[PDB]
Design a protein around this nucleic acid. Sequence first.
DNA 1: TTGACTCTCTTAAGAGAGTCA
DNA 2: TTGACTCTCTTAAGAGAGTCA
Lengths: 162, 162
Amino acid sequence: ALTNAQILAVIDSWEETVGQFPVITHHVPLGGGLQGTLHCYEIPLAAPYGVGFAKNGPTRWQYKRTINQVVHRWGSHTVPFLLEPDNINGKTCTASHLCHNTRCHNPLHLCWESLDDNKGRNWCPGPNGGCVHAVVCLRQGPLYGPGATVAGPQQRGSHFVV
Amino acid sequence: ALTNAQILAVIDSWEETVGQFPVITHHVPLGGGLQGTLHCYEIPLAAPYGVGFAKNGPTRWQYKRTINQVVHRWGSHTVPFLLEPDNINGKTCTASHLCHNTRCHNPLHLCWESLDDNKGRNWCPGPNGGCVHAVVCLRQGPLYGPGATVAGPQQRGSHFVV
DNA sequence: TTGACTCTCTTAAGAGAGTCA
DNA sequence: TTGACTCTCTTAAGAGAGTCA
Ligand SMILES: [Mn+2]
Ligand SMILES: [Mn+2]
Ligand SMILES: [Zn+2]
Ligand SMILES: [Zn+2]
Ligand SMILES: [Zn+2]
Ligand SMILES: [Zn+2]
Protein backbone atom coordinates (compact mmCIF):
# COMPACT_ATOMS: atom_id res chain seq x y z
CA ALA A 1 0.00 0.00 0.00
CA LEU A 2 0.95 3.64 -0.08
CA THR A 3 3.15 3.95 3.07
CA ASN A 4 6.77 2.71 3.21
CA ALA A 5 5.83 1.09 6.54
CA GLN A 6 2.88 -0.69 4.86
CA ILE A 7 5.15 -1.86 1.99
CA LEU A 8 7.78 -3.21 4.44
CA ALA A 9 4.99 -5.05 6.30
CA VAL A 10 3.83 -6.62 2.99
CA ILE A 11 7.38 -7.70 2.20
CA ASP A 12 7.85 -9.09 5.72
CA SER A 13 4.60 -11.10 5.68
CA TRP A 14 5.43 -12.40 2.21
CA GLU A 15 8.89 -13.47 3.33
CA GLU A 16 7.50 -15.19 6.41
CA THR A 17 4.93 -17.15 4.37
CA VAL A 18 7.34 -18.07 1.55
CA GLY A 19 9.91 -19.08 4.18
CA GLN A 20 7.57 -21.94 5.11
CA PHE A 21 7.32 -23.29 1.54
CA PRO A 22 9.06 -26.66 1.10
CA VAL A 23 12.80 -26.28 0.44
CA ILE A 24 13.83 -28.36 -2.57
CA THR A 25 17.52 -28.81 -3.35
CA HIS A 26 18.46 -28.59 -7.05
CA HIS A 27 21.92 -29.45 -8.36
CA VAL A 28 22.68 -27.24 -11.35
CA PRO A 29 25.31 -26.68 -14.04
CA LEU A 30 27.46 -23.62 -13.37
CA GLY A 31 29.40 -23.62 -16.62
CA GLY A 32 33.03 -24.69 -16.95
CA GLY A 33 32.12 -28.29 -16.18
CA LEU A 34 31.29 -27.35 -12.57
CA GLN A 35 28.13 -28.06 -10.58
CA GLY A 36 26.48 -26.18 -7.71
CA THR A 37 23.54 -26.46 -5.36
CA LEU A 38 20.49 -24.17 -5.09
CA HIS A 39 17.76 -24.32 -2.41
CA CYS A 40 14.44 -23.31 -3.94
CA TYR A 41 11.43 -22.44 -1.77
CA GLU A 42 8.66 -23.88 -3.93
CA ILE A 43 5.00 -22.87 -3.87
CA PRO A 44 2.72 -25.96 -3.64
CA LEU A 45 1.33 -27.57 -6.80
CA ALA A 46 -2.29 -27.19 -5.67
CA ALA A 47 -4.38 -25.25 -3.22
CA PRO A 48 -3.86 -24.31 -0.47
CA TYR A 49 -0.66 -22.43 -1.42
CA GLY A 50 -0.13 -20.29 1.69
CA VAL A 51 -1.64 -17.26 3.39
CA GLY A 52 -2.22 -14.54 0.81
CA PHE A 53 -1.43 -16.63 -2.30
CA ALA A 54 -3.63 -17.77 -5.17
CA LYS A 55 -2.98 -19.24 -8.61
CA ASN A 56 -4.05 -17.18 -11.63
CA GLY A 57 -2.37 -19.40 -14.24
CA PRO A 58 -0.72 -22.81 -14.66
CA THR A 59 2.63 -21.25 -13.54
CA ARG A 60 1.31 -17.83 -12.35
CA TRP A 61 0.42 -16.73 -8.81
CA GLN A 62 -0.60 -13.54 -7.01
CA TYR A 63 -0.12 -12.29 -3.45
CA LYS A 64 -2.98 -10.29 -1.87
CA ARG A 65 -3.39 -8.34 1.39
CA THR A 66 -6.19 -6.17 2.82
CA ILE A 67 -4.82 -2.74 3.90
CA ASN A 68 -7.04 0.16 5.01
CA GLN A 69 -10.05 -2.09 4.19
CA VAL A 70 -8.89 -2.27 0.51
CA VAL A 71 -7.49 -5.37 -1.25
CA HIS A 72 -4.00 -4.82 -2.74
CA ARG A 73 -2.68 -7.52 -5.11
CA TRP A 74 0.67 -8.18 -6.82
CA GLY A 75 2.29 -10.78 -9.03
CA SER A 76 3.65 -13.32 -6.55
CA HIS A 77 7.35 -12.81 -7.47
CA THR A 78 7.19 -8.97 -7.56
CA VAL A 79 6.77 -8.43 -3.81
CA PRO A 80 10.51 -8.31 -2.88
CA PHE A 81 10.93 -5.31 -5.22
CA LEU A 82 7.99 -3.11 -4.18
CA LEU A 83 10.40 -0.33 -3.09
CA GLU A 84 12.27 -0.37 -6.42
CA PRO A 85 11.60 1.61 -9.61
CA ASP A 86 9.06 -0.30 -11.69
CA ASN A 87 10.69 0.63 -15.00
CA ILE A 88 14.17 1.03 -16.42
CA ASN A 89 15.10 2.89 -19.61
CA GLY A 90 11.39 2.96 -20.43
CA LYS A 91 11.02 -0.82 -20.10
CA THR A 92 8.89 -2.57 -17.51
CA CYS A 93 10.82 -4.19 -14.67
CA THR A 94 10.09 -7.91 -14.25
CA ALA A 95 10.83 -10.50 -11.62
CA SER A 96 13.55 -12.72 -13.10
CA HIS A 97 14.27 -16.26 -11.85
CA LEU A 98 18.00 -16.81 -11.49
CA CYS A 99 17.19 -20.45 -10.65
CA HIS A 100 14.97 -20.91 -13.77
CA ASN A 101 12.31 -22.52 -11.45
CA THR A 102 8.91 -20.77 -11.73
CA ARG A 103 7.40 -22.28 -8.54
CA CYS A 104 10.40 -21.00 -6.58
CA HIS A 105 9.75 -17.85 -4.54
CA ASN A 106 13.16 -17.62 -2.78
CA PRO A 107 14.05 -13.92 -3.06
CA LEU A 108 17.71 -14.91 -3.07
CA HIS A 109 16.92 -16.47 -6.46
CA LEU A 110 15.15 -13.39 -7.93
CA CYS A 111 16.24 -10.15 -9.54
CA TRP A 112 14.36 -7.17 -10.98
CA GLU A 113 15.22 -6.29 -14.58
CA SER A 114 13.86 -5.73 -18.08
CA LEU A 115 12.12 -8.63 -19.83
CA ASP A 116 14.99 -8.75 -22.35
CA ASP A 117 17.60 -9.12 -19.55
CA ASN A 118 15.34 -11.74 -17.93
CA LYS A 119 14.91 -13.81 -21.11
CA GLY A 120 18.61 -13.62 -21.99
CA ARG A 121 19.68 -15.49 -18.87
CA ASN A 122 18.20 -18.64 -20.50
CA TRP A 123 21.29 -18.80 -22.77
CA CYS A 124 23.98 -17.56 -20.37
CA PRO A 125 27.05 -19.83 -20.02
CA GLY A 126 26.86 -19.39 -16.23
CA PRO A 127 28.94 -18.07 -13.32
CA ASN A 128 31.80 -20.50 -14.03
CA GLY A 129 31.50 -20.43 -17.83
CA GLY A 130 31.74 -16.73 -18.67
CA CYS A 131 28.63 -14.98 -17.35
CA VAL A 132 29.00 -11.20 -17.77
CA HIS A 133 25.70 -10.22 -16.11
CA ALA A 134 26.47 -7.47 -13.59
CA VAL A 135 23.96 -9.13 -11.27
CA VAL A 136 25.56 -12.54 -11.70
CA CYS A 137 23.74 -15.68 -12.76
CA LEU A 138 23.35 -18.50 -10.24
CA ARG A 139 23.59 -21.21 -12.94
CA GLN A 140 24.19 -21.84 -16.63
CA GLY A 141 21.01 -21.07 -18.59
CA PRO A 142 18.97 -24.17 -19.48
CA LEU A 143 19.11 -23.35 -23.21
CA TYR A 144 22.86 -22.74 -23.44
CA GLY A 145 24.57 -24.89 -26.05
CA PRO A 146 25.19 -25.49 -29.75
CA GLY A 147 21.51 -25.53 -30.75
CA ALA A 148 19.82 -27.80 -33.29
CA THR A 149 19.83 -25.71 -36.46
CA VAL A 150 18.30 -27.58 -39.41
CA ALA A 151 19.75 -25.46 -42.23
CA GLY A 152 22.34 -22.71 -42.33
CA PRO A 153 22.79 -19.73 -44.64
CA GLN A 154 22.78 -20.64 -48.32
CA GLN A 155 21.99 -19.38 -51.82
CA ARG A 156 21.33 -21.12 -55.11
CA GLY A 157 22.65 -18.38 -57.41
CA SER A 158 25.41 -15.77 -57.22
CA HIS A 159 23.47 -12.62 -56.22
CA PHE A 160 24.48 -12.37 -52.52
CA VAL A 161 27.54 -11.78 -50.37
CA VAL A 162 27.85 -12.04 -46.60
CA ALA B 1 1.38 -30.28 -54.69
CA LEU B 2 4.33 -28.33 -56.06
CA THR B 3 7.11 -30.46 -57.52
CA ASN B 4 10.78 -30.18 -56.58
CA ALA B 5 11.44 -28.29 -59.82
CA GLN B 6 8.59 -25.87 -59.08
CA ILE B 7 9.89 -25.18 -55.56
CA LEU B 8 13.37 -24.55 -56.95
CA ALA B 9 11.80 -22.10 -59.42
CA VAL B 10 10.09 -20.21 -56.50
CA ILE B 11 13.45 -19.96 -54.63
CA ASP B 12 15.20 -18.73 -57.80
CA SER B 13 12.54 -16.04 -58.45
CA TRP B 14 12.74 -14.95 -54.80
CA GLU B 15 16.57 -14.69 -54.92
CA GLU B 16 16.44 -12.69 -58.19
CA THR B 17 13.98 -10.16 -56.68
CA VAL B 18 15.70 -9.87 -53.24
CA GLY B 19 19.08 -9.54 -54.98
CA GLN B 20 17.81 -6.23 -56.38
CA PHE B 21 16.88 -4.86 -52.95
CA PRO B 22 19.10 -2.00 -51.71
CA VAL B 23 22.33 -3.43 -50.30
CA ILE B 24 23.35 -1.67 -47.09
CA THR B 25 26.82 -2.06 -45.57
CA HIS B 26 26.76 -2.34 -41.74
CA HIS B 27 29.75 -2.43 -39.40
CA VAL B 28 29.03 -4.84 -36.54
CA PRO B 29 30.62 -6.20 -33.36
CA LEU B 30 32.02 -9.72 -33.71
CA GLY B 31 32.97 -10.23 -30.06
CA GLY B 32 36.44 -10.11 -28.60
CA GLY B 33 36.63 -6.37 -29.30
CA LEU B 34 36.70 -6.96 -33.08
CA GLN B 35 34.55 -5.33 -35.75
CA GLY B 36 33.29 -6.85 -39.00
CA THR B 37 31.08 -5.93 -41.95
CA LEU B 38 27.71 -7.36 -43.03
CA HIS B 39 25.89 -6.57 -46.29
CA CYS B 40 22.13 -6.60 -45.82
CA TYR B 41 19.62 -6.72 -48.68
CA GLU B 42 16.82 -4.64 -47.20
CA ILE B 43 13.16 -4.75 -48.22
CA PRO B 44 11.75 -1.21 -48.74
CA LEU B 45 9.97 0.60 -45.90
CA ALA B 46 6.75 1.06 -47.93
CA ALA B 47 5.05 -0.28 -51.02
CA PRO B 48 6.09 -1.28 -53.62
CA TYR B 49 8.43 -3.85 -52.05
CA GLY B 50 9.30 -5.98 -55.09
CA VAL B 51 7.60 -8.50 -57.35
CA GLY B 52 5.71 -11.04 -55.25
CA PHE B 53 6.15 -9.23 -51.90
CA ALA B 54 3.58 -7.68 -49.59
CA LYS B 55 3.53 -6.49 -45.98
CA ASN B 56 1.23 -8.32 -43.50
CA GLY B 57 2.60 -6.50 -40.42
CA PRO B 58 4.87 -3.64 -39.30
CA THR B 59 7.95 -5.92 -39.63
CA ARG B 60 6.27 -8.90 -41.37
CA TRP B 61 6.09 -9.71 -45.09
CA GLN B 62 4.94 -12.55 -47.34
CA TYR B 63 6.00 -13.86 -50.75
CA LYS B 64 3.26 -14.98 -53.18
CA ARG B 65 3.39 -16.92 -56.45
CA THR B 66 0.51 -18.32 -58.52
CA ILE B 67 1.27 -21.70 -60.09
CA ASN B 68 -1.18 -23.60 -62.30
CA GLN B 69 -3.97 -21.24 -61.19
CA VAL B 70 -3.33 -21.86 -57.45
CA VAL B 71 -2.09 -19.06 -55.19
CA HIS B 72 0.79 -20.09 -52.91
CA ARG B 73 2.06 -17.88 -50.11
CA TRP B 74 5.00 -18.10 -47.68
CA GLY B 75 6.51 -15.99 -44.94
CA SER B 76 9.00 -13.77 -46.75
CA HIS B 77 12.12 -15.16 -44.95
CA THR B 78 11.03 -18.83 -45.16
CA VAL B 79 11.55 -19.22 -48.92
CA PRO B 80 15.26 -20.21 -48.84
CA PHE B 81 14.30 -23.21 -46.69
CA LEU B 82 11.37 -24.68 -48.65
CA LEU B 83 13.34 -27.88 -49.38
CA GLU B 84 14.30 -28.39 -45.72
CA PRO B 85 12.51 -30.19 -42.88
CA ASP B 86 10.03 -27.83 -41.22
CA ASN B 87 10.38 -29.10 -37.63
CA ILE B 88 13.11 -30.51 -35.38
CA ASN B 89 12.89 -32.11 -31.92
CA GLY B 90 9.12 -31.52 -32.05
CA LYS B 91 9.59 -27.76 -32.55
CA THR B 92 8.64 -25.67 -35.59
CA CYS B 93 11.53 -24.31 -37.63
CA THR B 94 11.71 -20.52 -37.96
CA ALA B 95 13.74 -18.20 -40.13
CA SER B 96 16.44 -16.73 -37.89
CA HIS B 97 18.31 -13.50 -38.72
CA LEU B 98 22.04 -13.93 -38.13
CA CYS B 99 22.36 -10.21 -38.88
CA HIS B 100 19.54 -9.20 -36.44
CA ASN B 101 18.07 -6.92 -39.19
CA THR B 102 14.39 -7.83 -39.77
CA ARG B 103 14.09 -6.01 -43.13
CA CYS B 104 17.11 -7.94 -44.43
CA HIS B 105 16.25 -10.83 -46.78
CA ASN B 106 19.83 -11.84 -47.66
CA PRO B 107 19.68 -15.68 -47.49
CA LEU B 108 23.36 -15.69 -46.43
CA HIS B 109 22.11 -13.92 -43.26
CA LEU B 110 19.37 -16.47 -42.43
CA CYS B 111 19.25 -19.86 -40.79
CA TRP B 112 16.41 -22.28 -40.06
CA GLU B 113 16.01 -23.38 -36.44
CA SER B 114 13.67 -23.55 -33.45
CA LEU B 115 12.28 -20.30 -32.06
CA ASP B 116 14.31 -20.80 -28.83
CA ASP B 117 17.58 -21.17 -30.82
CA ASN B 118 16.55 -18.12 -32.86
CA LYS B 119 15.86 -15.93 -29.81
CA GLY B 120 19.02 -17.07 -28.04
CA ARG B 121 21.27 -15.53 -30.69
CA ASN B 122 20.27 -12.06 -29.34
CA TRP B 123 22.62 -12.64 -26.37
CA CYS B 124 25.47 -14.56 -28.06
CA PRO B 125 28.98 -13.15 -27.49
CA GLY B 126 29.64 -13.62 -31.21
CA PRO B 127 31.97 -15.54 -33.53
CA ASN B 128 35.10 -13.91 -32.04
CA GLY B 129 33.79 -13.76 -28.46
CA GLY B 130 32.92 -17.39 -27.68
CA CYS B 131 29.95 -18.37 -29.85
CA VAL B 132 29.16 -22.09 -29.47
CA HIS B 133 26.31 -22.24 -32.00
CA ALA B 134 27.01 -25.13 -34.37
CA VAL B 135 25.78 -22.91 -37.20
CA VAL B 136 28.00 -20.02 -36.17
CA CYS B 137 26.73 -16.50 -35.50
CA LEU B 138 27.77 -13.78 -37.94
CA ARG B 139 27.96 -11.16 -35.18
CA GLN B 140 27.68 -10.56 -31.45
CA GLY B 141 24.03 -10.45 -30.42
CA PRO B 142 22.62 -6.93 -29.93
CA LEU B 143 21.63 -7.70 -26.32
CA TYR B 144 24.94 -9.26 -25.20
CA GLY B 145 26.49 -7.55 -22.20
CA PRO B 146 26.25 -6.87 -18.47
CA GLY B 147 22.56 -5.90 -18.59
CA ALA B 148 20.77 -3.18 -16.64
CA THR B 149 19.42 -5.01 -13.59
CA VAL B 150 17.65 -2.65 -11.22
CA ALA B 151 17.76 -4.78 -8.07
CA GLY B 152 19.49 -8.04 -7.26
CA PRO B 153 18.63 -10.93 -4.94
CA GLN B 154 17.94 -9.80 -1.40
CA GLN B 155 15.97 -10.53 1.76
CA ARG B 156 14.90 -8.41 4.72
CA GLY B 157 14.94 -11.19 7.34
CA SER B 158 16.84 -14.46 7.72
CA HIS B 159 14.23 -16.91 6.40
CA PHE B 160 16.22 -17.90 3.31
CA VAL B 161 19.52 -19.41 2.20
CA VAL B 162 20.65 -19.49 -1.43
C1' DT C 1 -2.13 -13.34 -61.57
C1' DT C 2 -0.84 -9.49 -58.98
C1' DG C 3 -0.50 -5.61 -55.40
C1' DA C 4 -1.69 -3.46 -51.19
C1' DC C 5 -3.89 -3.63 -47.73
C1' DT C 6 -6.80 -6.19 -43.78
C1' DC C 7 -7.15 -9.60 -39.70
C1' DT C 8 -5.56 -12.98 -36.05
C1' DC C 9 -2.06 -16.49 -34.22
C1' DT C 10 2.64 -18.84 -31.67
C1' DT C 11 6.08 -19.11 -28.04
C1' DA C 12 7.94 -18.67 -23.36
C1' DA C 13 9.81 -15.38 -20.38
C1' DG C 14 6.63 -12.28 -17.91
C1' DA C 15 1.68 -9.41 -16.18
C1' DG C 16 -3.42 -7.25 -14.52
C1' DA C 17 -8.22 -7.93 -13.05
C1' DG C 18 -13.16 -10.24 -12.10
C1' DT C 19 -16.32 -14.03 -10.02
C1' DC C 20 -17.96 -16.53 -6.44
C1' DA C 21 -18.08 -18.64 -1.54
C1' DT D 1 -11.28 -10.95 5.17
C1' DT D 2 -9.40 -14.85 3.03
C1' DG D 3 -9.44 -18.55 -0.42
C1' DA D 4 -9.96 -20.66 -4.99
C1' DC D 5 -11.00 -20.21 -9.01
C1' DT D 6 -11.98 -17.57 -13.90
C1' DC D 7 -10.48 -14.50 -17.85
C1' DT D 8 -7.30 -11.70 -20.91
C1' DC D 9 -2.83 -8.90 -21.59
C1' DT D 10 2.76 -7.73 -22.80
C1' DT D 11 7.00 -8.42 -25.31
C1' DA D 12 9.92 -9.44 -29.30
C1' DA D 13 11.63 -13.18 -31.79
C1' DG D 14 8.53 -15.44 -35.15
C1' DA D 15 3.69 -17.15 -38.33
C1' DG D 16 -1.12 -18.18 -41.65
C1' DA D 17 -5.07 -16.48 -44.14
C1' DG D 18 -9.04 -12.94 -46.32
C1' DT D 19 -10.72 -9.02 -49.39
C1' DC D 20 -10.92 -6.33 -53.47
C1' DA D 21 -9.94 -4.83 -57.99
MN1 LIG E 1 13.57 -15.80 -16.47
MN1 LIG F 1 16.27 -13.74 -34.51
ZN1 LIG G 1 14.92 -21.08 -6.81
ZN1 LIG H 1 24.72 -14.64 -16.71
ZN1 LIG I 1 21.29 -8.97 -43.10
ZN1 LIG J 1 26.34 -17.68 -31.49
